[PDB]
Design a protein around this ligand. Structure first.
Ligand SMILES: CCCCCCCCCCCCCCCCCC(=O)OC[C@H](COP(=O)([O-])OCC(O)COP(=O)([O-])OC[C@@H](COC(=O)CCCCCCCCCCCCCCCCC)OC(=O)CCCCCCCCCCCCCCCCC)OC(=O)CCCCCCCCCCCCCCCCC
Ligand SMILES: CCCCCCCCCCCCCCCCCC(=O)OC[C@H](COP(=O)([O-])OCC(O)COP(=O)([O-])OC[C@@H](COC(=O)CCCCCCCCCCCCCCCCC)OC(=O)CCCCCCCCCCCCCCCCC)OC(=O)CCCCCCCCCCCCCCCCC
Ligand code: HAS
Ligand code: HAS
Ligand SMILES: CCCCCCCCCCCCCCCC(=O)O[C@H](COC(=O)CCCCCCC[C@@H](C)CCCCCCCCC)COP(=O)(O)O[C@H]1[C@H](O)[C@H](O)[C@H](O)[C@@H](O)[C@@H]1O
Ligand SMILES: CCCCCCCCCCCCCCCCCC(=O)OC[C@H](COP(=O)(O)OCCN)OC(=O)CCCCCCCCCCCCCCCCC
Ligand SMILES: CCCCCCCCCCCCCCCCCC(=O)OC[C@H](COP(=O)(O)O)OC(=O)CCCCCCCCCCCCCCCCC
Ligand SMILES: CCCCCCCCCCCCCCCCCC(=O)OC[C@H](CO)OC(=O)CCCCCCCCCCCCCCCCC
Ligand code: HEC
Ligand code: HEC
Ligand code: FES
Ligand code: CUA
Ligand code: CUA
Ligand SMILES: [Ca+2]
Lengths: 63, 102, 54, 162, 54, 331, 154, 233, 143, 108
């Protein structure tokens, strides 16, 4: 529920943008940056999952 | 000089030379020679390079033919404030001035 | 009890020779340090030049 | 600070070939990552939580030796900065792993002052830890609240005692 | 900073910090270090007079 | 162990990435590892289940919806169950230690009767192998081959004292090298070539480790074993000899250094090449007969790769390696 | 910062007059190639040809020349893998011992001086059975027996 | 005698130096230079002072506790000399390496002060720019430095001048002849081994040491005296 | 301080027993994969670790036989029992930071091994320690 | 598993050891120190931490950690030693290091 959908979807392409670039460039310095893009995508994925976790089971009830 | 070596040289006019085959034991040239050593602006670093390093020299426009083989000869007086430079790094090939680290 | 300015091992002055540690006295080191930290900005104007030490 | 070095290690091991580190820099990186993470993060965070929580749990106003506790804090930070000063050396910091096995740490086999700075940074940290421990024993032995027998203490302060 | 930049030839030789690093420490420090000094000194003075009032 | 793993995909999972191994004690270590992993998986799942039960079953919202109230039973002590749960790990680690002692002792025992003994020298940063003794079956001469070089080892024994006299370390010179064995048949590892030690199949083999410089370690992943090589192993009270009952299959196998020795610790690879027993006699007779010939020439004489096929030498340039092609073309 | 991939201690070459050719990947290397010309006028070519061909294709120095001019050298054995043919003028070659252990061999050289100048640089062309190697080398005097010579004014 | 010494030289060389210098002294691509033609003196200087082996690529190699003794050093030098020769060690009149007999052109049993004068002017001309007036060392670019000369013996000084170890220029025996080199050794040892007449030397680093001493501790003690004599309010 | 004085007897006896067991073990067991012979490192450490814990335990017990029935140890004590002065505690002091800096200077001195740094560090260290120990007893300003 | 010698002969000083002590240290120190910070932030400050940011932090650290270090058991077993700065393409453990690195950046 909530932002978790979009925050996941925004990540799912960025992660796809990362790994693709990783399989494009050879072993090089830019492969490091490709790894960083891929990991940023994974982080936004988990960020979406964690806001979903908070929405499913709130523990700070009153805003 | 051997390769990658340095020596400070001064101007020595032919008249005030008393060495070699011309050596006269009773010719007092010391005063003028020392008077040439103590000139403010006439000490020059003569540098013999390695052949490998003489390949990658860049010549200045107009100073094309100044070298004589491996031998180059720069002025020892720093262009900043005029301390003797005198710190010739034999591998990095950087002449260094101790006064302010040029 | 402490030696200061042991001139006898410096030798007489001649303009072709210099040492690695050749700083001025302590109270002048500030005006040495300025000359060490200036980034070599020098002006050329036709027949004239303002050196980097101005 | 240590985790940044860890990430540099991982970035270098992402693919074969030395992309941006050398062998020497990689060695120094894992050495200093291990040292700072074990000795500058772990033991100081242990003693920090001990210092805050233990007097509240045992019902005391203050630790047994306050100035000794402050000395422990400051000497630990001094040791940390000494340990990290090795990177300012042209040759870099220590490079022999956080264990510092010999003969690799000998004068023959480990020149450069970074190898020495490790030794002092660790030592300054170690006495900082000891100065923190002197309190926690003496505090529990001497400043407990009325009615708080030894076996009514919380488990945390038991662990800190041991 | 001006003084120790004047003496950095000796400082780098003794304490084993690179001579270029010393010149750049002098350069960037003559901007940055004064600001840090001002900040810390100001806050410490305010803390001192707060202890007096306390 | 004498009992083999479950096998199949379960064995592959329990393996879990170990090499299969090429010696008897490698098989023993692998089997023990597989069954220990079985027991570990049992414990892991049977406690992750309880944590999951806490996550899903013992939640507060469920019990409050059920009407349990604001608090649970407030139980603190169950002494008999506590004593039982204390006794359980005691027995588990005890019965584990029994098989640990069994497998460890059959691994480490130095009674395997070597036919070949190879002296190994570790140095910063490469390996040097030297055949120390060979049984008469494999030796060129019919009688047992002994490889210690008299003049070069005499120099080693003479290095112990009196370089015009320093003798600080217990009366010996600080640069003593009398603990190193110098042999006349030697393979010398270089940055231009990965050294290759040639061994036969199905013979008890012995390794005698030592180190010119800082401590190293000899690790062959296919032996599932590694041992530290120290300078002056007798002075360290370190056991410098270890024996393998045999190698069971031919092939080329990489071996690495597993001890942090210095800058080029990663570059210190070697290869262990196991060859048909009949070909080993040809190899040793070739190396003995014309010692000027290199190791690669002997390997050609066998009829196999002159250079280590398992690992190629690293590129020694610190800039060329950026694009990931850090491998030197041996030929 | 000094321990990076570009390092000052790593880029250094030997403090010798002799140039050098060949990478670690090349089959045959020439180290310390120099044109010697003693004060007495005699001359020659100092060098060391090291064989490291992983194909084990043992070579034989067919010829060496300085600016196309011949240099005399004889009795050069083939150089199999991991072997060094050290060449120098006979007077300097006599100063060092031939090693009975190891593959090294010593060979003498001599060339007629066409008028080479001390300080300058001249090409040197080696040709072995497997190919030719070209390298510029400087001209200088041999090293004195250390400690014997004083500065003499006349 | 040398023929059997070369064997120990080879055995020691194979077990330490190959990783940087190759089996045939050809060098390695970025890991170490070629050692063809360096000679006995370079090996003696590098090993006896303990600079070699270098276990870390750095701005500069470091002196340290030597990994080999004297006889092993001469053995390795003999092995390297067999590959092309080079500058040689200064052997005395009986065959031992010259120590204490290099202290001046006119050495008899004590340092002659005329040699000390000439060597002082020579050292100020050539050596004192990278080192300092009395050889206390100095700094260079990008983390390199000129060491303090108090550690070396006379043979090490001579071979240092002869070989030009890393960034030091070579001083061949026809640029600085043996008389000049021995006078330089005499001046170095005189400055090393003579106490300062004017009390504690402060390291002879020059104005920096004197400044630091006074401007910190000398003024601190006098403000302490002032606090003794004055009041805090 | 009764319970903590007496609970230290378990660790010390365990360490002592392990020390003697280990000394006999390493001096007798000629197992393969290891070298027979007593090792002094480790055995010395075990015996002096037992020594540390025994020193703590014996001093605490020797003290505790003197003290009375303190209310913190009385299982049914009231908050009024401990009313009075708890003791003297330092409110504030700059000297811990000062002597930490002094130790840092001394440590840096032994890093580079400049002898003047070691001497000045030791002098500064004893100065800062003395100023720490005399903080609450410096005389009033003598007019 | 590391405690038994016959397994330690292969496991010692490999990436298996790395994964083991990172599991124990990152669990006992990082996870539980964060637990302590969240637990005693009220008592240490008089304020309560943001719950949502806490859950985000936890899930990021958890998934990044297990991604980083669970796969290093396999490279340790396959033969990669600890403290290795460079490795060959032919060794056979480049993909596992790549998987480790991406989740390591997630940990960062
Ligand atoms: C040899 C090396 C060690 C040298 C120091 C020896 C320490 C033990 C000496 C005996 C002792 O306990 O005296 C306390 C005793 C009682 O003081 P007190 O104020 O009545 O104590 C109650 C406090 O009021 C309670 O209030 P408080 O908590 O505010 O005061 C605590 C106070 C007093 O603390 C105590 O009395 C109990 C704790 C003892 C000290 C434990 C910490 C020791 C240092 C760290 C760990 C060891 C590292 C080695 O702590 C200290 O005095 C700290 C001493 C710091 C020593 C630093 C050494 C640095 C080494 C660097 C390498 O001290 C004195 O009155 C006499 C002077 C103490 C020693 C002077 C040392 C001379 C200089 C030597 C430096 C090296 C050169
Ligand atoms: C070179 C020759 C220079 C000659 C001209 C200068 C003469 C100065 C004579 C000393 C002087 O003025 O003393 C009074 C002068 C001020 O005394 P005040 O303000 O009248 O009295 C209140 C105390 O200063 C309040 O501080 P406090 O005394 O309570 O605690 C600090 C403690 C510091 O004492 C120590 O550091 C010594 C601790 C015992 C070490 C035992 C082994 C020594 C071997 O004692 C002192 O500073 C006084 C004794 C100084 C000599 C100790 C040696 O003392 C200082 O300023 C000394 C502070 C620095 C001492 C470093 C050692
Ligand atoms: C906070 C930091 C650490 C903790 C905690 C820790 C816990 C253990 N470690 Fe460790 N570790 C080793 C063994 C253990 C054992 C037995 C435990 C214990 O705490 C484990 C007990 C914990 C449990 C959570 C037990 C399971 C729980 C339950 C409830 C069941 C009870 C047990 C049963 C039933 C028996 C298991 C049953 C089976 C069937 C297997 C060994 C060797 O036996 C090495 C050296 C290896 C080498 O060759 O270098 C080692 C290496 C290290 C290093 C190496 C650093 C370096 O080399 O530079 C570090 C920093 C480290 C940290 C830490 N380690 N450890
Ligand atoms: C408490 C103990 C430890 C913790 C926690 C720890 C955390 C990590 N470790 Fe580790 N470590 C490795 C990877 C990691 C990674 C990726 C993390 C992660 O926790 C790191 C991520 C966490 C971070 C926290 C960094 C993020 C930083 C950011 C995002 C920004 C930086 C910028 C600023 C401005 C910071 C803000 C500053 C302010 C003042 C606010 C690896 C391999 O991937 C090896 C073996 C490598 C080899 O070949 O030997 C290793 C080696 C060791 C060793 C052995 C060293 C030796 O053998 O000599 C030890 C004892 C150890 C302990 C510990 N390690 N580690
Ligand atoms: C301090 C550590 C940074 C540092 O020293 O930076 C120097 C320049 O100063 C700085 O930025 C100092 C910044 C101070 C900030 C204010 C406090 C430049 O490095 P350098 O001393 O020339 O060392 C060389 C490498 O740069 C070069 O890559 C390498 O190839 C070598 O040539 C190496 O010797
Ligand atoms: C990343 C993907 C997973 C995100 C979490 C999704 C599950 C979830 O929201 O769990 C909520 C739960 C809190 O407990 P509760 O509200 O009772 O929910 C379980 C019964 N409905 O959450 C928890 O109990 C989480 C407690 C930590 C679990 C760590 C497991 C390792
Ligand atoms: C009664 C008292 C004794 C103290 C040490 C003397 C120096 C020494 O030993 O030198 C040799 C010594 C050499 O080592 P040694 O011979 O082994 O002891 O010097 C050093 O090692 C230290 C070098 C220091 C470099 C200092 C750089 C310039 C600092 C300028 C500071 C200016 C502060 C201005 C403050 C203004 C406000 C007041
Ligand atoms: C007080 C110091 C003033 C220095 C001005 C240098 C101008 C110059 O000679 O500038 C000339 C120089 C080119 O300018 C530059 O480097 C551009 C930067 C100049 C300084 C900007 C602050
Ligand atoms: C790398 C692991 C090395 C080992 C082992 C040894 N040396 Fe070395 N050497 C190395 C480097 C990086 C350099 C260049 C930097 C420098 O300090 O000059 C050198 C240099 C030398 C030289 C100087 C040559 C010259 O022309 O002056 C010599 C004479 C030398 N090395 C000899 C030597 C010997 C005999 C060694 C084993 C006994 C030895 N070195 C070890 C790196 C390494
Ligand atoms: C700067 C260009 C230098 C000049 C001019 C001279 N030397 Fe030097 N020297 C220099 C360096 C960078 C080094 C270190 C070399 C290394 O590999 O570490 C040295 C070293 C010496 C030594 C050895 C000192 C030691 O502790 O072992 C000696 C004895 C020495 N130098 C003497 C010396 C003399 C007598 C000089 C004038 C003729 C001279 N050097 C010039 C840099 C420079
Ligand atoms: S006098 Fe040369 S840099 Fe200033
Ligand atoms: Cu190694
Ligand atoms: Cu290694
Ligand atoms: Ca890489």
């Amino acid at each position: 529920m909530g932002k978790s959908f979009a925050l996941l979807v925004l990540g799912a392409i960025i992660l796809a943008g990362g790994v693709w670039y990783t399989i494009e460039v050879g072993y090089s310095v830019m492969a490091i940056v490709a790894a960083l893009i891929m990991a940023a995508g994974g982080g936004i994925i988990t960020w979406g999952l964690a806001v979903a976790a908070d929405v499913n089971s709130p523990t700070s009830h009153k805003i | 000089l051997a390769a990658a070596s340095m020596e400070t040289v001064f101007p020595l006019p032919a008249e005030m030379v008393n060495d070699g085959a011309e050596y006269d034991p009773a010719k007092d040239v010391y005063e003028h020679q020392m008077h040439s050593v103590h000139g403010p602006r006439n000490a020059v670093m003569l540098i013999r390079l390695r052949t490998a390093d003489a390949e990658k020299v860049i010549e200045r426009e107009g100073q094309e033919s100044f070298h004589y083989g491996d031998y180059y000869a720069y002025s020892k007086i720093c262009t900043h404030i005029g301390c003797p430079t005198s710190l010739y790094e034999a591998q990095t090939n950087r002449i260094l001035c101790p006064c302010h680290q040029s | 009890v402490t030696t200061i300015n042991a001139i006898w091992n410096l030798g007489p002055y001649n303009p072709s020779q210099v040492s690695a540690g050749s700083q001025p006295d302590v109270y002048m080191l500030w005006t040495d340090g300025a000359a060490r930290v200036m980034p070599a900005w020098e002006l050329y104007l036709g027949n004239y030049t303002i050196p980097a030490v101005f | 600070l240590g985790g940044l070095m860890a990430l540099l290690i991982r970035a270098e091991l992402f693919t074969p070939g030395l992309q941006f580190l050398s062998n020497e820099q990689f060695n120094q990186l894992f050495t200093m990552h291990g040292t700072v993470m074990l000795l500058l993060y772990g033991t100081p965070i242990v003693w920090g939580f001990a210092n805050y929580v233990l007097p509240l749990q045992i019902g005391a106003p203050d630790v047994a030796f306050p100035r000794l506790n402050a000395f422990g804090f400051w000497i630990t930070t001094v040791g940390g900065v000494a340990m990290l000063t090795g990177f300012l050396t042209p040759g870099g910091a220590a490079d022999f792993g956080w264990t510092m096995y010999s003969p690799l740490s000998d004068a023959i086999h480990s020149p450069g002052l970074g190898s020495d700075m490790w030794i002092v940074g660790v030592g300054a940290t170690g006495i900082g830890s000891v100065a923190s421990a002197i309190n926690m024993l003496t505090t529990i032995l001497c400043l407990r609240a009325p009615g708080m027998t030894m076996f009514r203490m919380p488990i945390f302060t038991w662990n800190i005692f041991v | 900073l001006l003084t120790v930049s004047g003496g950095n030839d000796v400082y780098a030789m003794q304490f084993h910090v690179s001579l270029n690093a010393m010149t750049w420490i002098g350069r960037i420090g003559l901007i940055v270090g004064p600001a840090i000094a001002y900040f810390i000194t100001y806050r410490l003075c305010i803390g001192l007079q707060r202890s007096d009032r306390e | 162990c004498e009992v083999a793993p479950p096998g199949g995909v379960l064995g592959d999972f329990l393996r879990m990435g170990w090499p299969d191994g090429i010696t008897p004690e490698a098989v023993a270590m692998g089997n023990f590892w597989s069954w220990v992993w079985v027991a570990a998986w049992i414990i892991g799942i049977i406690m992750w289940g309880l944590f999951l039960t806490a996550i899903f079953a013992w939640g507060a919202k469920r019990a409050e919806k059920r009407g349990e109230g604001e608090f649970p039973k407030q139980l603190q002590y169950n002494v008999p169950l506590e004593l039982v749960l204390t006794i359980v790990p005691i027995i588990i680690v005890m019965v584990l230690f029994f098989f640990t002692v069994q497998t460890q002792d059959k691994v480490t025992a130095l009674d395997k009767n070597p036919e070949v003994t190879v002296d190994v020298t570790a140095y910063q940063w490469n390996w040097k192998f030297g055949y120390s003794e060979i049984d008469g079956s494999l030796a060129p001469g019919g009688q047992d081959y002994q490889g210690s070089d008299p003049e070069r080892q005499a120099a080693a024994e003479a290095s112990k004292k009196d370089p015009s006299g320093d003798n600080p370390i217990h009366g010996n010179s600080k640069s003593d090298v009398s603990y190193l064995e110098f042999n006349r048949i030697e393979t010398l590892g270089t940055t231009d070539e990965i050294p290759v030690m040639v061994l036969p199949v199905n013979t008890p083999i012995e390794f005698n480790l030592a180190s010119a410089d800082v401590a190293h370690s000899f690790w062959v992943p296919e032996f599932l074993f590694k041992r530290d090589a120290y300078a002056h192993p007798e002075a360290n009270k370190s056991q410098r000899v270890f024996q393998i009952e045999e190698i069971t299959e031919e092939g080329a196998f990489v071996g690495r250094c597993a001890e942090m020795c210095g800058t080029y610790h990663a570059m210190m690879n070697f290869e262990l090449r196991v060859v048909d027993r009949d070909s080993f006699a040809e190899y040793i007779s070739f190396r003995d007969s014309n010692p000027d010939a290199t190791n690669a020439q002997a390997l050609e004489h066998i009829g196999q790769a002159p250079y280590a096929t398992s690992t190629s030498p690293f590129v020694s340039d610190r800039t060329a390696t950026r694009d990931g092609e850090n491998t030197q073309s041996n030929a | 910062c000094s321990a990076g991939q570009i390092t000052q201690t790593s880029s250094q070459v030997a403090a010798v007059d002799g140039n050098q050719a060949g990478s670690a990947n090349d089959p045959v290397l020439v180290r310390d190639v120099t044109v010697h010309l003693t004060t007495d006028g005699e001359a020659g070519v100092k060098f060391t040809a090291i064989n490291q061909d992983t194909s084990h294709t043992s070579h034989t120095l067919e010829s060496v020349t300085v600016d196309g001019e011949e240099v005399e050298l004889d009795d050069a054995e083939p150089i199999e893998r991991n072997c060094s043919l050290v060449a120098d003028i006979q007077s300097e070659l006599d100063l060092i011992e031939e090693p009975e252990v190891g593959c090294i061999q010593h060979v003498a050289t001599s060339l007629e001086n066409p008028g080479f100048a001390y300080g300058g640089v001249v090409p040197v062309e080696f040709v072995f059975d497997t190919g030719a190697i070209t390298i510029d080398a400087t001209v200088s005097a041999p090293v004195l027996e250390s400690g014997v010579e004083n500065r003499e004014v006349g | 005698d040398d023929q059997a010494l070369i064997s120990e030289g080879k055995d020691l060389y194979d077990v330490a130096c190959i990783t940087c210098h190759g089996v045939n002294l050809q060098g390695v691509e970025d890991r170490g230079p070629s050692l063809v033609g360096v000679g006995e003196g370079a090996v003696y200087f590098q090993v006896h002072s303990g600079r070699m082996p270098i276990l870390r690529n750095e701005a500069q190699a470091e002196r340290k506790a030597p990994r080999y003794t004297e006889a092993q050093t001469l053995a390795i030098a003999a092995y390297v000399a067999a590959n092309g020769g080079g500058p040689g060690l200064v052997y005395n009149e009986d065959g031992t390496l010259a120590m204490e007999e290099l202290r001046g052109e006119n050495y008899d049993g004590q340092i002659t002060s005329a040699d000390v004068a000439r060597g002082g002017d020579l050292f100020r001309l050539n050596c004192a720019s990278c080192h300092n007036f009395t050889g206390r060392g100095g700094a260079l670019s990008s983390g390199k430095y000129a060491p303090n000369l108090d550690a070396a013996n006379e043979q090490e000084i001579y071979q240092a001048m002869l070989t030009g170890p890393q960034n030091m220029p070579k001083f061949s025996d026809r640029q600085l002849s043996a008389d000049e080199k021995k006078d330089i050794i005499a001046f170095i040892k005189s400055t090393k081994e003579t106490p300062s007449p004017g009390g504690y030397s402060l390291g002879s680093l020059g104005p920096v040491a004197e400044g630091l001493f006074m401007w910190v501790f000398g003024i601190l003690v006098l403000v302490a005296a002032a606090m003794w004599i004055g009041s805090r309010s | 301080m009764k319970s903590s004085a007496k609970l230290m007897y378990g660790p010390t006896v365990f360490m002592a027993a392990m020390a003697v067991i280990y000394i006999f073990a390493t001096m007798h067991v000629s197992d393969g994969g290891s070298v027979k012979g007593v090792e002094w490192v480790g055995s010395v450490a075990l015996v002096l670790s037992a020594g540390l814990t025994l020193m703590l335990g014996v001093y605490l017990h020797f003290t505790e036989v003197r003290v009375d029935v303190l209310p913190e140890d009385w299982e049914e004590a009231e908050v009024a029992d401990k009313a009075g002065t708890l003791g003297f505690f330092s409110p504030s002091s700059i000297w811990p930071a000062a002597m930490s800096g002094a130790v840092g200077f001394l440590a840096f001195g032994v890093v580079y091994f400049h002898y003047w740094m070691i001497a000045v560090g030791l002098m500064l260290l004893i100065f800062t320690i003395t100023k720490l120990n005399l903080q609450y007893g410096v005389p009033k300003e003598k007019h | 598993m590391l405690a038994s010698p016959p397994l330690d002969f292969h496991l010692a000083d490999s990436y298996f050891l790395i994964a083991h002590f990172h599991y124990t240290l990152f669990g006992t120190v990082v996870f539980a120190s964060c637990a302590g910070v969240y637990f005693w932030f009220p008592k240490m400050t008089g304020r309560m931490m943001d719950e949502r940011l806490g859950k985000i932090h936890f899930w990021l650290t958890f998934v990044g950690f297990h991604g980083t270090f669970l796969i290093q058991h396999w490279v340790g077993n396959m033969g990669m030693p600890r403290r290795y700065a460079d490795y060959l393409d032919s060794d056979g453990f480049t993909i596992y290091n790549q998987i480790s690195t991406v989740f390591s950046f997630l940990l960062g």
